[PDB]
């Protein structure tokens with residue numbers, strides 16, 4: 211989130227960088243087939 | 259200092275995680291910075307009430323003989339040997355492989371079959387504390403995770419209150435009516451529940467109201483849904499569906 | 502005289518090399534290159550902030 | 551990644567699955583042996599699914615009951631045996647894979663590359679009105695497709711219908727069953743839309759079975775895609791289909807000649823015990839099913 | 842009756858099966874192919890179990906066909922195949938207790954569910970007389986004659 215939004219924290223991936231401590235981990239996106247492709251801002255566009 | 263000292267002798271009794279100890283230390287430093295009469299001092303003093311109130315290490319001990327579970331389930335629930343044998347295998351296996359172990363479970367059937375009644379009966383069997391929490395049809399995220407604590411009228415999510423009330427660190431929470439949880443665009447609590455129900459990430463749960471991570475790992479959660487099909491797949495796939 | 506802007510369009514079967522020629526032109530004229538996909542978008546604010 | 555053969559699951563579960571669940575219940579092998587025989591009975595009967603998840607639930611259940619038999623129960627070392635097994639995991643549910651066995655006329659097997667795995671769904675048909683409505687009657691024997699049709703499946707169905715109508719007069723002119731009677735036809739749902747047409751080669755054989763009324767030869771699964779002039783077309787996803795046919799006990803199978811390539815990529819042990827019959831023009835299949 | 846679309850395919854399946862059973866059985870009747878029929882299924886079944894009611898449906902129409910009343914207080918359930926084979930249905934224990942509540946004294950189920958029914962407490966099973974079956978023709982001789 212913007213960090214000016216109330217309650218903002220960086221997206222999940224950043225938590226993985228803080229936790230996993232490498233610059234080159236092995237992210238495993240799961241179940242791409244069921245990604246929410248809605249009118250409300252398609253995350254699947256955001257993933258590209 | 260008065261409130262700081264009563265909560266601090268508290269702190270001396272309940273064994274807080276050292277991380278949460280230092281985090282309340284810096285927060286108490288801010289409370290020293292904060293004014294004696296400010297309305298934000300009231301919000302953060304009642305924050306100190308909600309935070310200090312939470313048990314941190316109080317650990318209700320369980321019975322571990324199956325026999326006493328035999329009786330106490332028989333004390334308050336006839337027949338239904340399938341569900342009893344299931345709970346019996348549950349205790350029998352957790353009793354074998356050393357320490358207490360988590361798993362989520364659900365009971366489902368026509369209303370009034372005794373679901374919640376066996377819940378509490380098990381709660382007094384294991385000696386864990388009881389706390390119902392209906393979630394049928396809920397939508398707002400302020401009752402599950404809480405508010406930011408910077409909003410006017412902000413209060414911590416329901417869980418912080420159950421810990422405040424039950425006084426043990428390892429109770430038997432009973433979420434109720436999971437099947438009809440409001441899964442909307444306004445921040446889906448049903449998605450938010452995964453942080454509760456993640457076997458590893460429950461151990462460091464945190465919520466926007468009180469930032470400090472909580473450690474729920476010892477809690478024995480329970481959840482109740484009338485039908486197993488409506489529950490969304492990511493939540494439904496973890497837990498066993500007893501009938 | 503001066504440099505001038507202009508619009509153009511290309512069309513044909515996928516994988517014919519369209520996008521590939523784009524960059525070759527970019528280093529031909531010496532202008533900077535910049536891709537910008539817009540397939541399937543609907544948030545006009547994304548095109549305008 | 552693909553699915554798994556019935557035998558293949560045995561070598562998996564004895565090593566990579568049983569010990570894991572054994573670590574979930576915290577026991578050691580010293581007290582809770584599980585022979586191979588229990589495993590083969592399990593996978594052969596109680597779980598017909600391409601994934602291994604279902605067997606994983608079963609073996610979990612068995613282990614945890616063993617844990618109850620140890621910590622409080624009688625035995626200090628449970629020893630599952632198939633005769634014992636029905637205690638722990640209850641009575642068998644499925645056995646009679648492939649419901650019909652005599653296959654009464656006008657029902658034919660058909661493979662389908664469903665969204666998960668593959669399944670040997672049957673196709674069925676039947677009369678819907680008296681046939682001799684008029685000895686002179688000239689009304690098209692209208693079909694009625696059913697079974698959650700997508701519209702694309704509807705054109706495929708009409709095409710196969712017309713080819714049936716042509717094949718009869720090409721073969722046995724005196725019969726007129728198809729053009730003079732109404733017919734309901736039912737394709738069970740489950741196939742994903744892209745393979746939807748792939749069922750069609752089954753369809754025509756259904757109708758013809760109804761026409762002469764003779765039964766299809768037993769357990770001769772088939773698949774294909776019909777061309778409106780008797781050419782057949784390639785189908786997709788063959789490896790899943792072949793394993794699904796293997797689970798049901800099929801002992802013959804028929805494929806478009808265009809996929810004679812992909813089927814041979816399969817590991818040799820997977821293909822043992824089948825007897826394939828590649829074909830391209832449709833007339834071929836007619837001689838490998840009925841007579 | 843608040844039909845789900847699955848009930849529409851089930852209804853046509855059962856309907857055609859009736860039309861075939863009559864012509865194979867009693868040619869002199871022609872009621873089905875020559876008459877309209879209203880049919881009403883009261884709501885309450887959840888969509889996923891929807892097809893399980895279907896085996897009841899065909900016997901409804903047949904009662905109208907020959908016109909004799911069905912044999913009294915004979916509850917049943919099942920799942921029809923469009924060629925008279927029957928299939929297992931799920932959740933039998935709730936169904937059987939409801940049938941016990943109603944004073945039912947006979948019942949008919951697919952043979953494939955002979956397993957789950959034996960889990961039931963023995964007091965539940967006293968006084969019933971069950972009839973497992975696979976092909977539909979069986980049911981026809983246990984109602985009318």
Ligand SMILES: Nc1ncnc2c1ncn2[C@@H]1O[C@H](COP(=O)(O)OP(=O)(O)O)[C@@H](O)[C@H]1O
Nearest residue numbers: 334335336337338369370371372373374375376
């Ligand atoms: N085997 C049983 N033993 C004791 N009480 C039972 C039993 N079965 C049903 N009940 C009763 O059913 C009621 C239902 O309560 P409860 O399980 O607490 O909530 P719910 O209505 O969600 O099932 C209780 O009043 C309880 O006494």
Ligand SMILES: Nc1ncnc2c1ncn2[C@@H]1O[C@H](COP(=O)(O)OP(=O)(O)O)[C@@H](O)[C@H]1O
Nearest residue numbers: 511513514515516517518519520521522523524
């Ligand atoms: N005439 C060509 N010379 C060199 N490469 C070509 C030619 N035509 C196509 N390609 C290759 O096709 C690929 C894709 O071409 P491009 O138009 O850039 O993307 P797309 O074809 O998908 O629109 C490029 O990697 C490019 O090397």
